[PDB]
Write a protein that binds this ligand. Structure first.
Ligand SMILES: C[S@@+](CC[C@H](N)C(=O)[O-])C[C@H]1O[C@@H](n2cnc3c(N)ncnc32)[C@H](O)[C@@H]1O
Length: 261
């Protein structure tokens, strides 16, 4: 409970985008919405803590924030305190959006497909609620190789050594499957890199992100197995990664794929 809420805030701090980057992304998303004269309303499926939503909410756009997770929405509610007059919070499943047909102008989806086996049901709901001329706005972060990549690969290796090998490349495969559906559905997906930057991260911060299972790929392992892997990984890092508090750069990019009805 308090534990679930802390994990939610932890997720928010780990995935936060630098202010300039948040701004670049929000501008690209707002530019893609074409409301013929109406006040544009955005719907985000899997809004989480509101990492993607706040930048837009802050600029005054009507926003419907949908998520199945109560703890994530509790953080979202606190994050938008004082700037929530045009926000509607919704606790529901993206496979059954409680909104009318043709009721929104843009539907935002960032880091959700890989968590939904029957994602085509979500895509169909997004299309159902989008108004003619509406846009599906998919976004995702990408990272280049760094010591964080080395740590994550070491985690994967240790997991396999414990007898629990983990799946690789689900987000990317899922993303391709969705593009296949978007083409087929006549939504003409257009992808563009909307932000590229380098941020600092220390070996210790990367280890803590793994410890707290803040990455979906670390969530499959039984918790005690992850606990054993983390003890191994902290010791390995202390022996092989030098000053655990020395920052290293991590180059990232954010891609936006816009499809239109
Ligand atoms: C990986 S997070 C990303 C949140 C936010 N979009 C961001 O980019 O920071 C995934 C979110 O989707 C939610 N979620 C997963 N499956 C869902 C579903 N079926 N319906 C609604 N929300 C779902 C999770 O609870 C979580 O908040």
């Amino acid at each position: 409970s308090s534990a679930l809420l802390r994990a939610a805030y932890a997720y928010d701090r780990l995935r936060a985008h630098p202010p300039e980057v948040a701004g670049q992304i929000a501008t690209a998303m707002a530019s893609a919405v074409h409301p013929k004269g109406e006040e544009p309303v955005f719907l985000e499926l899997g809004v989480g803590t509101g990492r993607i939503a706040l930048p837009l909410i802050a600029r005054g756009y009507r926003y419907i924030a949908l998520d199945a997770d109560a703890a994530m929405l509790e953080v979202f509610r606190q994050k938008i305190a004082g700037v929530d007059r045009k926000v509607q919070v919704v606790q529901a499943d993206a496979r059954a959006i409680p909104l009318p047909d043709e009721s929104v102008h843009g539907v935002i989806v960032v880091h959700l497909w890989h968590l939904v086996p029957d994602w085509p049901k979500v895509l169909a709901e997004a299309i159902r609620v989008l108004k003619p001329g509406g846009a599906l706005l998919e976004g995702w972060d990408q990272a280049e190789a760094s010591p964080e990549w080395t740590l994550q690969e070491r985690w994967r290796a240790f997991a396999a050594e414990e007898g629990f090998p983990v799946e690789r490349g689900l987000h990317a495969k899922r993303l391709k499957e969705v593009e296949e559906a978007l083409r087929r559905l006549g939504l003409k997906p257009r992808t563009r890199e909307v932000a590229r930057w380098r941020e600092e991260r220390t070996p210790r911060e990367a280890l803590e992100a793994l410890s707290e299972r803040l990455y979906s790929f670390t969530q499959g392992l039984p918790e005690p197995v992850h606990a054993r892997v983390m003890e191994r990984l902290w010791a390995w890092a202390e022996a092989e990664l030098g000053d655990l508090d020395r920052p290293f750069p991590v180059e990232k990019r954010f891609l936006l794929r816009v499809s239109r009805l």
